[PDB]
Amino acid sequence: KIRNLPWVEKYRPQTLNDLISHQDILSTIQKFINEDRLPHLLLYGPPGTGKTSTILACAKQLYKDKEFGSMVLELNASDDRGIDIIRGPILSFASTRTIFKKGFKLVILDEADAMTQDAQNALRRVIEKFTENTRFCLICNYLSKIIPALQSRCTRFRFGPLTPELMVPRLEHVVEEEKVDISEDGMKALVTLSSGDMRRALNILQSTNMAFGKVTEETVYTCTGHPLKSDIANILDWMLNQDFTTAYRNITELKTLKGLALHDILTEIHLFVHRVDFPSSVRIHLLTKMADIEYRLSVGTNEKIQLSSLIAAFQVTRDLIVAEA
Amino acid sequence: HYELPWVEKYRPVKLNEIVGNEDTVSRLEVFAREGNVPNIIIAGPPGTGKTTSILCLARALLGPALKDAMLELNASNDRGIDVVRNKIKMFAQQKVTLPKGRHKIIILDEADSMTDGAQQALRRTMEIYSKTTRFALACNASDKIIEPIQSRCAVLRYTKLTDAQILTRLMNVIEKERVPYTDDGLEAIIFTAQGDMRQALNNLQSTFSGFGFINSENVFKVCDEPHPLLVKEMIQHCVNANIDEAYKILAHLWHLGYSPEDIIGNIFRVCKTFQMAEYLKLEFIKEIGYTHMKIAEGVNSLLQMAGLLARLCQKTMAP
Amino acid sequence: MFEARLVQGSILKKVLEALKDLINEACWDISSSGVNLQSMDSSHVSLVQLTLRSEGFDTYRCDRNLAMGVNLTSMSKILKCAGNEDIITLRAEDNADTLALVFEAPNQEKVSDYEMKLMDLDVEQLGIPEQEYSCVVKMPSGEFARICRDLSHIGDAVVISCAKDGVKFSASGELGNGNIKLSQTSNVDKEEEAVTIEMNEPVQLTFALRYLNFFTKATPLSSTVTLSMSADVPLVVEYKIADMGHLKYYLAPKIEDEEGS
Amino acid sequence: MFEARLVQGSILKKVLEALKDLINEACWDISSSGVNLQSMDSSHVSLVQLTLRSEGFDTYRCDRNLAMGVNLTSMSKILKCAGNEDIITLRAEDNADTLALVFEAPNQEKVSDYEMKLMDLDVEQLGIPEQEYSCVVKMPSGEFARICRDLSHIGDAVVISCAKDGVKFSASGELGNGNIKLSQTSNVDKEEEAVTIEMNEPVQLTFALRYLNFFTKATPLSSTVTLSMSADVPLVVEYKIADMGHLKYYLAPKIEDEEGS
Amino acid sequence: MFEARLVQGSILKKVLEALKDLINEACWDISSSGVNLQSMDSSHVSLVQLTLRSEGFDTYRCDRNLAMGVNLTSMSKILKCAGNEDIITLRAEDNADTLALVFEAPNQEKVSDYEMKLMDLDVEQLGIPEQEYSCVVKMPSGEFARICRDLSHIGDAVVISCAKDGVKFSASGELGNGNIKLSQTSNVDKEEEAVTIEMNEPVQLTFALRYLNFFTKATPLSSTVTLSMSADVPLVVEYKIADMGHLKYYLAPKIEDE
Amino acid sequence: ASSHCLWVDEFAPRHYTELLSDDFTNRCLLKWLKLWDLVVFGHERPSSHEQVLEEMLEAGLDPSQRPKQKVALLCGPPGLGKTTLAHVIARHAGYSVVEMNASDDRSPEVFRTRIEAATQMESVLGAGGKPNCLVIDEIDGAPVAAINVLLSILNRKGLLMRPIICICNDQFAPSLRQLKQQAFLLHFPPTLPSRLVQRLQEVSLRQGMRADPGVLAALCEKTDNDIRACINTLQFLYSRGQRELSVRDVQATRVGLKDQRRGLFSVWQEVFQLPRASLTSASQRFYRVLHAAASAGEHEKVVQGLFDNFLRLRLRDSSLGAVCVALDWLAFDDLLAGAAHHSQSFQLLRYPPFLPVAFHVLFASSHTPRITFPSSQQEAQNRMSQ
DNA sequence: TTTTTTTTATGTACTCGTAGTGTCTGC
DNA sequence: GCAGACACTACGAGTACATA
């Protein structure tokens, strides 16, 4: 049947085989499940890498549909997770048995970085004392927000960013099941603008399929609003080659015609500075200047003045680079 | 029955199986043999074995009178102003027959979560009933425990585990578990553990369950290299105003998926104990805090971290 | 269309004051046979099954089956303002979200239409095993509620043991041990007060006290409560309402560890 | 010079906790006919009229017409130390700026006097029009206490209508509406439960929930409560305090918001 | 092995609510003559002496001399589940940390075995309080509890002065003054209501109110109360019980006399 | 029962002659308790900070034959014997000790009835009964209303007829401000190392083991003049395996080291003054200043003291660069406090602990600065509110 | 050899006082 | 049968602090 869902939730890896990237971690987790020795897990990494979907596939594989409510106590940041919950429902779930079928339970704590330090300190002996009856999985994005005792109690698996080589076939499966016409440069633009995140890749694909009907590099860079690599190279060429008024006129004409934003321009220029063989002092000055401009754009500021400062940060170092020789 | 993980299955049951801090563990073994132990606070890093030492000492001292002459309280319990007044005090006055040299043991694990008023109320019940009962506290940060409680005990302090001390128990677990291995893989396990025996056992069990053999690349496929060991070298590169290698390490840590908050926190911890000038360290810490303000308000990209690295390189060349 | 009608409103009051501090939301399962309610508590430890027969209602019609998720904290504030000798009406349309709770005041004049808003919590159907129990005990609900209150004074978790002679209640608490053993007290004038043993295998299990006293709030529902117990399957506190149906409870045992010594 | 004696001490233990949270001052006006209290809030939403006649006092001596103001903060702490069935005597001199309050036992050698500073307040009488309303109905006091607490669990603003069938209490919120229409209960043993309608023009208006719930803790002062309201005249709630006088309340209508998309 | 089978659970019920807030502990001294409780407040204010002999129980067995340091609040949750007309088996082992109480309280076969963890206190010794009392009278118990509640309404301390006509009770407060004069009430049909005067050297002392009212909490337990007081010697109320034993109390007066 | 007791309880003082406190404090407490005999025992005859205490002892009596100081407040660091001296002095003067602690409920009604029970009636034993001496340990942990109840029962003009001894660990608590204007203020100096080393020698000799006095002096300097910590540390280090204590065992940090809550004035003195002359390395001074300033607590008061005291020194920076960067550091702390209290990101509070070590690096001098308490910011805020 | 006070804007945790309220006792 | 007394839990209120 057809369903009205976003593509980041319609296409969810219900099994561990449908996830793409972290093959060694998932093989170790499947060997933990198959040998009935699953320990307390600590799944951490950047967003969109598949940490919630991994433990949901684990809970679906471990327990059937007729007994899922008796085995999984899933608590996230949307629910109240105070020390009353740790000393109350979580402790009573951990210290008791199962109603229907004999087996070990699972307490999934999504967004464990948002838990308070009192609840995390109260969670230590609940994990340690009842490790035979239940297992605790903590999923976080920031490992610095988890106390070192909880990091010691749970073995950690770093769910790193999804590389674009293994990220292609999942997008191909979504395209084939969604009947989407896509070119090679469109898939390249998806796996480039996503930057290790399969959620925003599917969001970009759905938004481009709704906006244009086709997925090409032009359509993706128009729907997202990102500047293309050639235009960033042209902006760098104008800032490094011509005088202030002509480069200002060229960059302002390009930004008016394409409707570009200065944040993406600053990001791509910062990426192109480290590739360009600059001197160390020039690179240090440029990095400090673009850090100042990108900080300045976080408030109610005029974007034209910041664009003039972005040109100025290269017009300062043009003479230094040339006289360096 | 379900098989326990190697952290809790291979918990030491006697005081001679605990490695690390040999003098303190030997004195605890002597106390467990003879008796009349004083009030004890054990402080140290996580995974050192403070709970293991306290429970082994209590099990060896009490024995068959364990279920009635030992009161164990944790952070999962309340331990408020009412629990100290009606539960610690009533158990302290409670009459339990015991052999000579043996006392009731009140184990207060994770005493940092104990409030200040409860620790103030804990003092007089600790001093009055010391003829009949004894106290055993375990903590990570000893500064959270108040000074009158620390004056009432022999505050023992545990150090981080030496690699040979982890290696001996790694031999023990390997020969009872029949784990094939190489030497370099076990050095990789020790390197990933970093003084944490829980992390050593967890990483050894993960590598044995996922691959069945312990070499270096089998360990590093599922475990990770520790983060501040690269941050130390990148801060060292920032000291000599070398922005290229510092950005190389920063981009390597960025492509590994580390959030800017974790990176800047480990930068601050490395710069806390780094070996440079004092004024240079102070302006480095001020620059780190100024960047962390921008991280906290909402803007957190690779450009901000590169700007922080460039400002740290600027601080050296600006006397 | 769904139109149920409680013959007295005191039956609904005693049901939902027992699940007020226990269950999270009321998931009414509606069919032609009757009104069902099978939802766990917040801690996923206890399970409540409630089945009300259609023959006990005044008039009951149900054209199509519905799943009826209703928040109970907002629901339990309406049975406070409900009479006990009074008429309770429950209405639900085919594709709407309003839930008309129409009744009368204790002054007994006025219609009082109160509305609820339905929730969309999908829930997987929890399979009741319906297996034979190795200890079946009939016991009055007033006596079962009294010794659960006395055992909450002494300890935190109670050891409940059943055998050939009778049930036995033990509470290893802070102040000491509290042991109550009752048997064969059917030699009285009343028929509600009776202790009867049906099966043979002797079990021993430890349960949390905070849920056993929660289950005994259904004392005005039934004069006699059936206690079902075995080694693997949990404890059952079974209330059978006289002309409405039955109220079925489950409570998982606690994890205990023997000393190594 | 003002000196008065009460028959019961529970009258001030039932009238003065009601205005614990309405008004910031207690202005008593002395006349030969009796005492008068007309005060407003800081929000200018509720007006309270308290008139106790001189014929019911044990003694009453009055010579001049003055105006004294009493604060609430020190007064509320005093009455918790006072008795319930005792006699309460008051004293106030012509030139002294300190009202004396005595709550002695009816058979006691010594008195207990907790005096307070007289607040010199400059207020004026707005003047109630005492015009003919649109509906005047009589209601029980204790039942009015329950129905004001009834709608407090639904929303923050309630709607009171009064047509020829009865007086309609409505409370619309995010949970669900609740409609209550008291009518035609003259066939009872007590004369208290007789709900009658005297007039006829129907008026629909919206009144704030909190000030009615601040009123209904003074319900055992009287037997019945008379409710009077009109289209633009504020709602009048009438109390008759035994044989010593009467009490009148006033609520302006709550301001209804707009409706948008 | 120690066993004490009290024939009614009402008499051991009515002991403890009299001494609930009064003493923080109970020290049952176990001997062949009977039970003994020489308990003492930590502020040296009131003393409780309780002795019930062996013949007043259903049975009594004692091997050697024993002492029961017992938490009093921890006992009080047992008697809340006890009955009024039932048999109470107060038992303990010789060298053990427990004290069991076996009864059938709800009269529905319900064998309740409630154990109590003993506590150890220091062995303080109060041998014999001296009894050279100048003023002794006998009073009804139910009248004594009512006048102690009457003076608790107004004042916070009672000035008690003995006299040949009777014992005079006085109290003062900001609300008023409570005072009554005791007269000779021996001309009644009830023998417990009669006041007997066998005193000399009248004295006038001041006593606290929060300690006097809980002395009169056990007034249904015994019909007659014997008041004993003198100069520089604490007041004694005495509850002579019918068959199993006797109860007496002690109360130090206030420093500020009259 | 040698194996049934702690060494602090076995070697506890029972007589007056075996106390280890300062002798003055003992004389002052004994003379304060011995003048109470006129009202309690009914007998006329009993048988700088120095000058104020000696004047106030012989200050006379008010017209109630009772002292003008109705309680005695005993202040000092933990581990000297304040409770021990109070109990020994109370048992020496014929009194009976009534102990108040933090393990009681300490609600105002409970406090009121317990003081009224302890102090306002005599003994039940009658003649020969010892009078009741109320000892209130840990009065600094009591709430404000409990101290108000104590001052209400102190000033009844129902007069107080029995002495009360109050023991606290910090006199500068806000709940004990009024008490200090009414009490016999006894300040406890830290114990002398010679008597402490001799008492540790007696303790070690009574247990039949040898420790030379160099390692005992090292233990005394490590445990901060603490009898209880040193005796517990000796009990752990001796055991029965060996008899001779090694210097390297005490010099090791694995046993007997406790975190010490440093005072504000000690922190300001260690920041503004260099240690007198190994320990000459600047990194060790950096870590020591940072750790002790973090361990002191009350960071805002430290910031206010550094703001109010850094301009009164003999500054060698005539170009005002150090003053400018110190004000930059103070503005950095203020910006961090605003950013932590605005964005709800409290992980920015790890850097304002580095403000006192920045002031120590900038203004390290070998002089003796006169550090006063900060009050300009508080009086400015009060005046602005006014 | 030196000691007062409420501002920062939420979120959470702790502790304590108070107030309806179910239930038990008694004439 | 109804008035008084007992403990019970829910709720309002004040205060502290949040980092390594």
Ligand SMILES: Nc1ncnc2c1ncn2[C@@H]1O[C@H](COP(=O)(O)OP(=O)(O)OP(O)(O)=S)[C@@H](O)[C@H]1O
């Ligand atoms: N490894 C993956 N393989 C396939 N699809 C993936 C993968 N990771 C993410 N997705 C897709 O992205 C969606 C969201 O993934 P999530 O598991 O919710 O990400 P996440 O790891 O939970 O990140 P955070 O920290 O919770 S925002 C999934 O429903 C999939 O459609």
Ligand SMILES: Nc1ncnc2c1ncn2[C@@H]1O[C@H](COP(=O)(O)OP(=O)(O)OP(O)(O)=S)[C@@H](O)[C@H]1O
């Ligand atoms: N010194 C040790 N020798 C042997 N095994 C150890 C040692 N320390 C830790 N372990 C192992 O690690 C497990 C956990 O040790 P714990 O004693 O719980 O650590 P910890 O010192 O209590 O740290 P925290 O503060 O509780 S997180 C034990 O069950 C052992 O299996």
Ligand SMILES: Nc1ncnc2c1ncn2[C@@H]1O[C@H](COP(=O)(O)OP(=O)(O)OP(O)(O)=S)[C@@H](O)[C@H]1O
């Ligand atoms: N002269 C002494 N010789 C040996 N031990 C002593 C001596 N004087 C005191 N002690 C012990 O040292 C401790 C004295 O401290 P206490 O008086 O109990 O408490 P305190 O010194 O007031 O400090 P705090 O604030 O209460 S922790 C007790 O354990 C005494 O037994």
Ligand SMILES: [Mg+2]
């Ligand atoms: Mg997720």
Ligand SMILES: [Mg+2]
């Ligand atoms: Mg531990």
Ligand SMILES: [Mg+2]
């Ligand atoms: Mg002390």
